[PDB]
Each structure stands twice: as C-alpha cells, then as structure tokens.
Amino acid sequence: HNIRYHHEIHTSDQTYHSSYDPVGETTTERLVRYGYLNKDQVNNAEAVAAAAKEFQEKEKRSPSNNIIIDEISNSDKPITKENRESVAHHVRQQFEFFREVNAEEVWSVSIEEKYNPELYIYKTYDMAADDPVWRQVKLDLEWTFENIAERRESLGYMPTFKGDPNFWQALDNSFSPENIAQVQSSIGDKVTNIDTKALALNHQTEEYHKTSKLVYPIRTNLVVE
C-alpha cells in the first residue's frame, strides 16, 4: 500500500562541464578577443588596466585566470603560459594522480604480485587437483548435493503442482453457484465439479492450486507376472 516513492527521486544521471580558454593566449590577447580592450589600446598601460578591471568586474574572473568554468573539479589554480610555476604544479599533480589511481586499484596493479608471482602449473591429469581452491569447489558441490539428498530423504516425499482442469471454468467463484452451473452446462462442460454444494463451499474462498505428492523411493513400474 506504499506506492509513493516507487519512482526513484534520486538518479545517477549528472554531468559536469569544464571549459578553458587557450593557454597560449596572453591577458592582452584575451581582453582583445572578448572586446574589453581595443586592438590599438594594448600599448596604453592605463587602458589595459581599465579593460582588465572591467573584465574582472563583469565576467567574475581575473584576466590572467584561464578557467571559464570548472564544474568537473572547481580548480582555483589556472594553468597559463605566463606563470611557469603552473606547469610544474600541474606536473606534480599529474604524477600524484598517476601514483594514487594505481594505488587504489584492487586487482589491476599490485607491486606485491609483481615481486612475488603466483603461478598455476599443469602437473596432473586432473587440473582441479593442481589448485587447492578447485578441490574445495568440488568438495563443496558434493557436500551440497549430499545435504540436499539427506533433507529430502528425511522428509520422505515431495510436493508437486498438479494440473486441474476446473481451473479454467467460465465463471469465478464470486458468482452464484447456480450461475456457475448454468454457464458450465450451457458450454457443455462435463469434466468439472459442478456440484452445487461444492461450489457453495468454494464460494468467495481463496486457496492454493491443486498439489500432489511424489513418494520416495523413485522406482520403475514393472510387470513381473
């Protein structure tokens, strides 16, 4: 009776965008391209400073900053041609990532595996025997089979689903027994239980389908005489 929240309100469909200007461009070139600074005004230091101030005020980032948007990582350190220390910082970050990404792997990389190799050697007819794990797999499978057999033998029989042609009556039990019998007679059904009292007993009754029993031990029927 709890249908609210059936649909997943929280989903795993999320995207992030990172856009940067060319690292080759200088502050003056960036200002000229964006239009804040006129092409011929680059010489005038005062004009360049005014254009930089306007750019910072309007676009919410310094002209030196190369990051238009960094939703991916929100990095506050731009990489530019002018600041040569940015290249060194990025190189250090790249090598840090190269170490850490491999470190966090569980199976892909392992220096312990590199320096202590573990080999599988084919040396016997049974390839399972060469591996302790596969021998245990065989033993576990046989143990499971034996446990299932023991449980079933102790129970002594097996319930089974038995087809019942009366499951396909024209009318439901919710209808009157007289109506059910009349419809069955009209459709000429003679292999179904149309007893009025039985139908009345089953009226508005919910119960499981017909079941039979398979009785152990399983043996072949024979005509010995």
């Binding site: 995207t15 569980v106 892909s108 576990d140 299932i148 449980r151």
Partner: protein, 126 residues
C-alpha cells in the same frame, strides 16, 4: 574499480594471464577461465543460500520445517531481494496489469512505444 558492472567486484575469483603471447597460452587461459567460471557460479549461488537453520535448545539439533518449501532446498533466489527491497517485491508480486489501472497503462505504453529514455550519450562495456 571504475568499470565493474555486476556482482563481480565483490566476489573473490582469479583471472589468469600468460608470459607467452602464443596460441598455447591462449588455450590454457581459456581452459582456466572455464574452470574458474565454476567457482564464480558457486559463489554467486551461495550468496542466495540459507546454510544455517534453527537449532533446538534442548537437543542442539536442527529444527526442519516439514511443510515449508525451504526444507526442499538450501538456495532461495528471492532471499536477498525480499530481505532488502521488501516494498518493491511486494508491489511487483501483488500488482499486475489485470487488476491495477496504472500497471495496465504502463504495460500498454511499454508494448506500444518503448520506455522513454532521456536524451544523452553513454558508452557501456562488458
């Protein structure tokens, strides 16, 4: 870590590689992978199995249900699903298209025009 797509990442199995890149090594790898698929299947089936059972205090022996389905078998596929997603399992097993208007509408739409998929690009590998 970043590319697992099923229960594999939480199963303890082994993958095999050869120091010779020849047909013989490839054949050995295929044989070993066939053998290890058995171990993976065994682990997967065990993940949905009820091995333990109620033990009587007086006799310290198992109390097996005589007229319960769980006595026939030790593997119950719906075990974890029922245990964790109880509401979803109940809705799935109680509401269908023959008695629920919403289920009928979903069935009709599903089989007339497939489910709507939001626009986007994906690359998924196995």
């Amino acid at each position: 870590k970043t590319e697992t797509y099923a229960n594999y990442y939480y199963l303890n199995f082994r993958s095999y590689t050869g120091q010779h890149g020849d047909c013989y090594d490839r054949f050995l790898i295929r044989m070993n992978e066939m053998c290890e698929s058995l171990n993976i299947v065994n682990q997967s089936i065990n993940k949905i199995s009820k091995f333990n059972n109620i033990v009587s205090i007086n006799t310290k022996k198992n109390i097996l249900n005589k007229e319960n389905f769980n006595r026939q078998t030790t593997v119950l596929p719906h075990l974890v699903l029922s245990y964790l997603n109880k509401n979803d399992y109940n809705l799935k097993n109680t509401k269908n298209d023959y008695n629920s208007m919403e289920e009928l509408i979903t069935h009709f739409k599903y089989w007339s025009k497939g489910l709507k998929v939001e626009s986007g690009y994906t690359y998924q590998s196995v």
